[PDB]
Amino acid sequence: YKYTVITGASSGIGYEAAKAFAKRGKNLIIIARRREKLEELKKEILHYNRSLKVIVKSIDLSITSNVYSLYDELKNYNIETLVNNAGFGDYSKVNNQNLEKVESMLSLNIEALVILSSLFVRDYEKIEGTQLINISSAGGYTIVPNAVIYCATKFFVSSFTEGLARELIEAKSNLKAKVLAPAATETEQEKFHKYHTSKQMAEFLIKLYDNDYIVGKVDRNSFKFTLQNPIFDYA
Amino acid sequence: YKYTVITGASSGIGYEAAKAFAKRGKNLIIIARRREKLEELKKEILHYNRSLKVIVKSIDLSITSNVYSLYDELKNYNIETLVNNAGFGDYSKVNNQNLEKVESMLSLNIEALVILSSLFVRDYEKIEGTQLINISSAGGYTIVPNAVIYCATKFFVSSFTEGLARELIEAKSNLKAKVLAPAATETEQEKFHKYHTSKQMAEFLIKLYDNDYIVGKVDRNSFKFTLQNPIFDYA
Ligand SMILES: NC(=O)c1ccc[n+]([C@@H]2O[C@H](COP(=O)([O-])OP(=O)(O)OC[C@H]3O[C@@H](n4cnc5c(N)ncnc54)[C@H](OP(=O)(O)O)[C@@H]3O)[C@@H](O)[C@H]2O)c1
Ligand SMILES: NC(=O)c1ccc[n+]([C@@H]2O[C@H](COP(=O)([O-])OP(=O)(O)OC[C@H]3O[C@@H](n4cnc5c(N)ncnc54)[C@H](OP(=O)(O)O)[C@@H]3O)[C@@H](O)[C@H]2O)c1
Known part of the structure; x- marks a missing residue:
């Protein structure tokens, strides 16, 4: 059996992504801190399709050692798709920002995503049908006032993922890497401002998965979702 | 007594930057792991100008708690300029990269630079004459094959620093933030390929310090150094 691994599966995009992959008949490994929420999701998925396998892994990926330990626990499973979706934003001027939140x-x-991405590439680069999908942000391509540090983390995610995707193509590797860049969603007034629901964003994630473009990005102004080629300059 | 604080001062650009600021009459706080190299630099500086105050701080900035401990010690001094120059690079394909080096x-x-930058902003944003200079790379604006993760760290540095610089301007802060983006230097056959020496880069750093532009960047193709406005898209 093959598995789709989703970090940040207890709420938001990752939760809806788990449901979307389940509707496609995928076995799932769902990871987040809130164990009860993950168990709730598992019950919903199995009520929908009793034949699926769903593995719950409650773990804090902000601790480096837990990232490596999670990956080693996953060695007993054939991973078809890894979605690095867990992430966090804090909006503040830099001068008075909580530096523990920054950490x-x-x-x-950054760290959990790059380590899990790199371990997955190390082991699965040559395996047919594999995909790595990293969740960045439209703010990983445009700096947004009051989100300077958050945006910088997403510039990291976008540039890392584009670079890796192009490296894999140049190497003729079987594994593909792709980046999803949501704009405003419900997890961030609503009457006057455009946003996507987490369900809509999971649908866009499936579109990215199903197509052969590296970038799936929501324009921050028009809110149009577009599949497109890498955005950053490349030597 | 005011001080210019330079991380990564034991060799390379930071070493030459220390000498350049000493020639401008600046007291210095010089930081790196190799205490003996910092002590040698101090002796070279005082041979030139015996009246300068040069404080040696040997510390490993790859350990989070040390970054905060260092900043606490720096509270004993009036900091005019902070240069976040300590950094390193590793060139590899992702699939077999040393993940210890990546960490x-x-x-x-990323972490030492953003923490020291943010603490400095907190305390000095309203202090006349202060400058924060972060050392990125031309690879923080162009992804370079075989340097995917390194480039992503520099995309972080560039986007963080541009965002912060613009935040300070919008807030009418006294503190200025700027980013230096070197291309190839001697720290990275030779007779066919252009590069800047560390001394030349330190001269470009002084030019950035002296002028009214956020970005000082070496073009990867022509090796021309240009002072310019922020490069990344901004909302
Ligand atoms: N405009 C934007 O930039 C934008 C908008 C939407 C989404 N996004 C991105 O999309 C991703 C998903 O976000 P979302 O909107 O769905 O928000 P969300 O509802 O807050 O989901 C975040 C997920 O990550 C989990 N997680 C958080 N901290 C964790 C930790 N230390 N260890 C393990 N898991 C952790 C959270 O669950 P637990 O608390 O149970 O651990 C949750 O499942 C994120 O990368 C976010 O940055 C960006
Ligand atoms: N084209 C490019 O991308 C490019 C080219 C050149 C330079 N740069 C950037 O310029 C900066 C300076 O580099 P450089 O060329 O001058 O290289 P370098 O000669 O290797 O200098 C690096 C400095 O950082 C120090 N340092 C390294 N690790 C440290 C640690 N854990 N804790 C504290 N200090 C540490 C090193 O001294 P110790 O070993 O004594 O700690 C040294 O003083 C770096 O940010 C580098 O990325 C970029």
Whole structure:
């Protein structure tokens, strides 16, 4: 059996992504801190399709050692798709920002994502049908006032993922890497401002998965979702 | 007594930057792991100008708690300029990259720089004459094959620093933030390929310090150094 691994599966995009992959008949490994929420999701998925396998892994990915330990626990499973979706944003002027929150953004949005991505590439680069999908942000391509550090973490995610995707293509690897860049969603007034629901964003994630473009990005102004080629300059 | 604080001062750009600021009459706080190298630099500086105050701080900035401990010690001094120059690079394909090296790159190139930058902004944003200079890379604006993770760390540094610089301007803060983006230097056959020496880069750093532009960048193709406005898209 093959598995789709989703971090940040207890709420938001990751929760709806788990449901979307389940509707496609995928076995799932769902990871987040809130164990009860993950168990709730598992029950919903199995009530929908009793034949699926769903593995719950409650773990804090902001601790480096937990990232490596999670990956080693996953070695007993054939991973078809890894979605690095867990992440955190904190909006503030830099001068009075809570630096412990900053540390969290760095550990989760950058470190956990790059380590899990790199371990997955190491082991699965040559395996047919594999996909790595990293969740960035439209703010990983445009700096947004009051989100300077958060945006910088997403510039990391976008540039890392584009670079890796192009490296894999140049190497003729079987594994593909792709980046999803949501704009405003319900997890961030609603009467006057455009946003996507988490369910809509999971649908866009499936579209990215199903197509052969590296970038799936929501324009921050028009809210149109577009599949497109890498955005950043490349040597 | 005011001080210019330079991380990564034991060799390379930071070493030459220390000498350049000493020639401008600045007292210095010089930081790196190799205490003996910092002590040698101090002796070279005082041979030139015996009246300068030069404080040696040997510390490993890849350890989070050390970054905060260092900043606490720096509270004993009036900091005029902070230069976040300590950094390193590792060139590899992702699939076989040393992840210990990756962790160190993340900790030093991103975490130490963002923490020290943010603490400095908190305390000095309203203090006339202060400057924060972060050392990125031309690879923080162009992704370079075989340097995917390194480039992503520098995309972080560039986007963080541009965002912060614009935030300070919008807030009418006295503190200025700027980013230096070197291309190839001697720290990275030779007779066919252009590069800047560390001394030349330190001269470009002084030019950035002296002028009214946020970005000082070496074009990867022409090796021309240009002072310019922020490069990344901004909302
Ligand atoms: N405009 C934007 O930039 C934008 C908008 C929407 C989404 N996004 C991105 O999309 C991703 C999903 O976000 P979302 O909107 O769905 O928000 P969300 O509802 O807050 O989901 C975040 C997920 O990550 C989990 N997680 C958080 N911290 C964790 C930790 N230390 N260890 C393990 N898991 C952790 C959270 O669950 P637990 O608390 O149970 O651990 C949750 O399942 C994120 O990368 C976010 O940055 C970006
Ligand atoms: N084209 C490019 O991308 C490019 C080219 C050149 C330079 N740069 C950037 O310029 C900066 C300076 O680099 P450089 O060329 O001058 O290289 P370098 O000669 O290797 O200098 C690096 C400095 O950082 C120090 N340092 C390294 N690790 C440290 C740690 N854990 N804790 C504290 N200090 C540490 C090193 O001294 P110790 O070993 O004594 O700690 C040294 O003083 C870096 O940010 C680098 O990324 C970029």
